[PDB]
């Protein structure tokens, strides 16, 4: 009763950080490749089609943050349980999250569906021009449970060191979505709604794999059954203690990017075009970090389960090192090949280079405050990972951008310095928790 992933988790923290992060970074990246595909197919459809997607953006990101957040709590809870050699607890978190996926998932469907037609009118939609917005959001919400179930299944797997089969789910989902996108949109001639049916149908297949894995094959470490089910008030508090603040965190990172564009619109439209494009390019370097963060949580949780800080500190500190040296390469590439990177994303070329030479430099500082939030979720304290994210993106990143604006260079100058301070605050606070554990 011990799989390969468990032996990684219950082993050398340095070995665990790497061999879990790589397939995660892969999985995180292959799905980003989809967003670029679906990004270029939808573009050619016309002005009217992009207006339905952009309106269906908050509801999508809203139910992605929820699904992913619940998965983070699941991943962290199972990881901590397995670290403490508690199978009976680990098996019981897997079942608890599966029921929560049903509750959270379907509720998202039945709550949003009757409210989706007023959402558009509230924003000021015409009724015929944005009549696709309701049709696009209808298809996605019809699988809002599948999205959550997929995330939970992914959270269950990476929570027991099974990042390889977790990667498979991310690839199979993005791959099918990639091949069905041109067929549904263009070949079958469904238009923008075809992209929704492609995403829907692809997630169904992923769940079929996920279900086959932990319901049919059952070749996973944990045992999933209801035969002697014990509804726990503690496991429920556990998953939500990380999950709920995780959902708000993923929202806050993008709910602050709006204010950054507001400081770009105030300093106007030609400036917002420069900011948005430069931001999209620079933010691509976050994808490798996200994998490291997903791997950090899994290993600092197992170390917290094994109750030894030297392992928890090693994995969390090793995580920063690799993420530092990964961004070191990324930043250099973007700064050196700036005109080359601009050409592909601009089909304002001069103002973009002025950004892509200064702005991306904050990517190097990021891993400090990010691995800390990751291990904060690893030990189970998500409320601290949330308040550190609020401090970073909304308080410092935005606050400095407004302090410099009251030209356009002050926007990147605010984002960098604001994220520089937040990294310093984040790393120190992460260190303090370690010493507090060493004294516990």
């Amino acid at each position: 009763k011990t799989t390969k992933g468990v032996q990684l988790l219950r082993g050398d923290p340095k070995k665990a950080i790497v061999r879990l992060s790589i397939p995660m970074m892969i999985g995180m990246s292959v799905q980003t490749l989809y967003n670029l595909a679906d990004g270029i197919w939808v573009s050619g459809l016309g002005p009217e089609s992009l207006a339905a997607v952009g309106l269906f953006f908050p509801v999508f990101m809203g139910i992605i943050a929820l699904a992913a957040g619940l998965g983070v709590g699941t991943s962290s809870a199972i990881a901590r349980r397995i670290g403490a050699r508690d199978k009976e607890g680990a098996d019981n978190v897997a079942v608890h999250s599966l029921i929560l996926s049903l509750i959270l998932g379907v509720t998202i469907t039945i709550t949003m569906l009757p409210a989706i037609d007023s959402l558009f009118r509230s924003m000021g939609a015409k009724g015929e021009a944005v009549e696709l917005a309701i049709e696009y959001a209808r298809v996605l919400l019809a699988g809002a449970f599948i999205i959550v179930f997929n995330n939970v299944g992914n959270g269950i797997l990476r929570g027991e060191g099974d990042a390889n089969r977790a990667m498979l789910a991310m690839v199979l989902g993005s791959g099918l979505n990639i091949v069905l996108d041109p067929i549904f949109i263009y070949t079958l001639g469904f238009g923008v709604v075809g992209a929704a049916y492609a995403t829907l149908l692809s997630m169904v297949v992923t769940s079929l794999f996920i279900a086959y894995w932990l319901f049919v094959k059952r070749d996973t470490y944990v045992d999933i059954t209801l035969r002697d089910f014990s509804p726990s008030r503690e496991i429920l508090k556990d998953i939500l203690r990380v999950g709920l603040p995780s959902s708000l965190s993923q929202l806050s990172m993008s709910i602050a990017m709006f204010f950054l564009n507001s400081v770009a619109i105030t300093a106007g439209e030609n400036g917002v075009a420069v900011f948005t494009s430069a931001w999209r390019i620079t933010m691509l370097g976050i994808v490798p970090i996200l994998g490291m963060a997903a791997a950090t949580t899994s290993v600092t949780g197992a170390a917290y389960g094994e109750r030894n800080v030297e392992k928890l500190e090693t994995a969390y500190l090793y995580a920063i090192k690799i993420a530092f040296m990964i961004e070191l390469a990324v930043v250099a590439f973007i700064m050196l090949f700036a005109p080359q990177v601009a050409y592909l994303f601009t089909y304002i070329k001069g103002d973009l280079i002025s950004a892509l030479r200064t702005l991306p430099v904050f990517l190097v500082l990021t891993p400090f405050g990010m691995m800390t939030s990751a291990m904060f979720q690893g030990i189970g304290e998500g409320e601290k990972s949330l308040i550190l994210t609020i401090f970073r993106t909304l308080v410092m990143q935005v606050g400095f951008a407004y302090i410099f604006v009251h030209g356009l260079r002050g926007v990147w100058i605010g984002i960098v310095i604001g994220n520089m301070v937040a990294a310093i605050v984040g790393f120190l606070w992460g260190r303090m928790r370690i010493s507090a554990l060493k004294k516990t």
């Binding site: 995180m28 980003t32 990004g39 992605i64 983070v72 992914n154 789910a169 991310m170 989902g173 994808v287």
Partner: peptide
């Protein structure tokens, strides 16, 4: 993408 985080991070 979907699993996990947000991301996108693209339009």
């Amino acid at each position: 993408x979907v699993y996990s985080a947000v991301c996108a991070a693209a339009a």
